[PDB]
Specification:
The complex is a heterotrimer of chains A (58), B (82) and C (381).
Chain A lengths: L1 E3 L5 E2 L12 E2 L5 E4 L6 H6 L6 E2 L4
Antiparallel strand pairs in A: 1-2, 1-3, 4-5
Chain B lengths: L1 E5 L5 H10 L10 E4 L6 E5 L3 H8 L15 H9 L1
Antiparallel strand pairs in B: 1-3, 2-3
Chain C lengths: L1 E6 L7 E3 L4 E3 L9 E6 L1 H12 L5 E5 L2 E6 L5 H6 L1 E4 L41 E11 L4 H10 L11 H13 L4 H16 L15 E4 L6 E4 L1 H10 L21 E7 L16 H21 L5 H18 L20 H5 L6 H10 L2 E3 L11
Parallel strand pairs in C: 7-8
Antiparallel strand pairs in C: 1-4, 2-3, 5-6, 6-12, 8-11, 9-10
Helix pairs in contact in C: 3-5, 7-8
The chains are: A alpha+beta (58), B alpha+beta (82), C alpha+beta (381).
The complex binds zinc ion (ZN) (4 copies).
Function (chain C): DNA-dependent RNA polymerase catalyzes the transcription of DNA into RNA using the four ribonucleoside triphosphates as substrates.
Subcellular location (chain C): Cytoplasm
Organism (chain C): Pyrococcus furiosus (strain ATCC 43587 / DSM 3638 / JCM 8422 / Vc1)
């Protein structure tokens, strides 16, 4: 599991699908899971517009 | 509303992902979930009703319980911030 | 039969450095007035469980023999002072550690190394360790006593909820029936019921086995009383007020009833029934206490969603409560993977057979047992 250095999206791929950055770090921390963006308070505080695996400390 | 949910040792990230499986795929209105690395054996679940949480965790391995009460959003911002 | 180095200054069991040829008290720092008392291992062991039970067996001498034992509640300072180590690792030996086994705690296997004393496995009385508790936890033995004190004393200021008029007459009434135990308790219950029915400073309370509340209105919102509130609330009560309750200013401060430091028994008290070895019940719960205690400290030092701390704090309380008394009313008994319930402290110090209720009343009142006229040979002289 590698988390992106800009948007924070944790992905298994060679690139973050949401944006498409090749910059993926291994030493990441604090998992955040998103189901809904519009209703969830969590997405608002961080600023994530796409549901799925996001990170905090990279 | 944020509901604190008990989890087994290390099983934080795994049960956090596992709970996400019974959400839309079963028709359960969970908004979000928080699995912070500095938190030991507990998971936050953003849900509207108490039934929503109870229904999600039910039948989920290594996800022991659900806390009596609700966690105020202000107490949760800290982990999300860093 | 075992020789025990007892401190003359403070009645505590002094250390004998076999390696450095040094006999001294760890608690009051005494180095001269310390005597060697002949004793049955039975009774050295008995003293040592009492200590691990947060009870302070203050030893008073006569002649090179114990004249009497004053009962009391061990102070965190004492518990910390008498400790040889701060226990940190919830691990058995795997074969020795930095946790529950000889981390300067006592030798029991062919590895003679110790707490400077370096005395061989073959005769080295263990030394107490200590766990520093992430949050205070109620000493189960004193729960009902705390309840009484809590309901009989005022919040914010801490007075005995009696008019200075009442105190003048009652303290005088106590002095009269101070010697006679049964009528002193007849007066203790009277004071309580009389201050329990008062509500003006010159809310109510609920229980079991360690849970306390205060019913407040806005609507019966029952506010739960947490050990830090209960502890600090009790640290207030002046020494002046203490005799209008069971407690003694020197021997048993009310605050000492909510644990801040839990003594870890010496290794000699907790032997494994070796063959994968049959680790002693007291060591198992001690692993479980540390296990949670570090998990608490972790979530305290990290983010505090409080609902979590509460859940963990309540669990640390549980573990301490079962360790103190597994046969406790309102306590689901801790069992090992088989269903057989653990046999802990209260289970040990009761068959020297001892009825625990009595122990606590002793420590509460600061009772002095004497060992002199119709002598007990089962404890050597
Ligand atoms: Zn990206
Ligand atoms: Zn001393
Ligand atoms: Zn030793
Ligand atoms: Zn008052």
């Amino acid at each position: 599991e590698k988390a992106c250095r800009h948007c924070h999206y944790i992905t298994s791929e060679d690139r973050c699908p949401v944006c498409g950055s090749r910059d993926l770090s291994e030493e990441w921390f604090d998992l955040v899971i998103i189901v809904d963006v519009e209703n969830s308070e969590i997405a608002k505080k961080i600023g994530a517009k796409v549901p799925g695996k996001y990170a905090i400390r990279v | 509303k944020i509901f604190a949910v008990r989890v087994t040792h290390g099983q934080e990230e795994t049960t956090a992902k596992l709970i996400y499986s019974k959400v839309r795929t079963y028709n359960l209105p969970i908004y979000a979930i928080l699995a912070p690395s500095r938190v030991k054996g507990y998971i936050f679940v953003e849900a509207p009703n108490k039934g929503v949480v109870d229904e999600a965790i039910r039948g989920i391995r290594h996800a022991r319980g659900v806390l009596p009460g609700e966690v105020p959003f202000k107490e949760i911002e800290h982990f999300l911030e860093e | 039969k075992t020789e025990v180095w007892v401190c003359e200054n403070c009645g505590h069991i002094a250390l004998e450095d076999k390696r450095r040829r040094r006999v001294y008290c760890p608690v009051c720092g005494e180095e001269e007035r310390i005597s060697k008392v002949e004793m049955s291992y039975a009774f050295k062991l008995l003293l040592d469980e009492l200590k691990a039970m947060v009870i302070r067996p203050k030893l008073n001498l006569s002649e090179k023999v114990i004249g009497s034992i004053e009962f009391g509640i061990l102070s965190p300072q004492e518990i910390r002072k008498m400790s040889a180590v701060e226990v940190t690792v919830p691990d058995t030996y795997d074969p020795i550690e930095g946790g529950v086994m000889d981390k300067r705690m006592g030798v029991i296997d062919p590895g003679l190394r110790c707490e400077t004393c370096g005395g061989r496995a073959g005769e080295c009385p263990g030394h107490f360790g200590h766990i520093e508790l992430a949050r205070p936890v109620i000493h189960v033995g004193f729960a009902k006593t705390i309840y009484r004190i809590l309901e009989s004393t005022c919040r914010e200021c801490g007075r005995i909820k009696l008019t200075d008029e009442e105190i003048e007459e009652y303290m005088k009434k106590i002095e009269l029936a101070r010697n006679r135990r049964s009528e002193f308790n007849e007066i203790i219950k009277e004071i309580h019921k009389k201050a329990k029915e008062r509500m003006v400073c010159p809310p109510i309370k609920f229980e079991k086995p360690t849970i306390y509340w205060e019913i407040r209105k806005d609507n019966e919102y029952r506010h739960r009383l947490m050990p830090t509130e209960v502890r600090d609330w009790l640290e207030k009560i002046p020494d002046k007020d203490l005799p209008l309750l069971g407690l003694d200013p020197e021997k048993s401060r009310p605050e000492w009833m909510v644990l801040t430091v839990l003594p870890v028994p010496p290794v000699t008290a907790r032997p494994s029934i070796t063959l994968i070895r049959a680790e002693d019940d007291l060591t198992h719960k001690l692993v479980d206490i540390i296990r949670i205690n570090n998990r608490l400290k972790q979530n305290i030092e990290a983010g505090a969603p409080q609902l979590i701390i509460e859940d963990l704090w309540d669990l640390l309380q549980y573990h301490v409560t079962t360790y103190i008394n597994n046969e406790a009313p309102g306590v689901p008994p801790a069992k090992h993977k088989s269903g057989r319930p653990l046999k802990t402290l209260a289970q040990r110090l009761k068959g020297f057979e001892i009825t625990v209720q009595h122990l606590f009343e002793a420590a509460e009142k600061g009772e002095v047992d004497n060992l002199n006229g119709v002598i007990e040979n089962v404890l050597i002289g």
